[PDB]
Amino acid sequence: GPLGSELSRQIKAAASTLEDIEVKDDEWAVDMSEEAIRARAKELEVNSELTQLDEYGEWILEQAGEDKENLPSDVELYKKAAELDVLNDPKIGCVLAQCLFDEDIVNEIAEHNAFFTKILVTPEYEKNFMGGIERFLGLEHKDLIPLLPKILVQLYNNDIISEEEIMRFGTKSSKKFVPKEVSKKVRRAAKPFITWLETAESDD
């Protein structure tokens, strides 16, 4: 056929590799091979910090529910972070950006100023928070991307995120949080605000 012997063999091998993964994943709970036992042991050590972040996000979502008006108090949000030992993890900003907000984000992002100042210790935390916003709008709620200019005004005016990190989010391609096509779309939706900022900084 049009593929040729070599490409047909490559495609068939890929399919079989994928089919084997599906069998291994589907039968994991009855798999007592040395490979599966060792893998389950490694997943515990490698994902310890991730499990702690997951538990924080799960608690936030479980306590607030669909509406973010039932969100635990900022004091409660901080206490749980300390309890789970995630305060020293820059990815806590990524968790908060993806779990604290709903469709009322423009109003919600400005209701936790003191909390963010205390939690976002370094620019790395701010970058992780911006990455989380990129995922929340670019991947999970594409319908809210039109709110990005307003979201950025709230971040800049309330000094929640530095001008430098807002500029990196709007002008730099980071493959760490979202795919390149999603990044391009978010930066475009941010351009109206970023252009204003670049001009305001040029005017000094």
Binding site: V75, A82, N113, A114, T117, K118, L147, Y156, N157, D159
Partner: protein, 40 residues
């Protein structure tokens, strides 16, 4: 013809006016007080 509500609201809010550093540090004080009441 696309809606303009979201962009227009942002365009209207555009302002170099920013939260005062002292204002940011002051809100921090009430929060730290609430934290101290919790032993943190």
């Amino acid at each position: 013809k696309e809606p303009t509500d979201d962009i227009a609201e942002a365009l209207g809010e555009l302002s170099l006016k920013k939260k005062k550093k002292k204002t940011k540090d002051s809100s921090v004080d009430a929060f730290e007080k609430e934290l101290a009441k919790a032993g943190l």
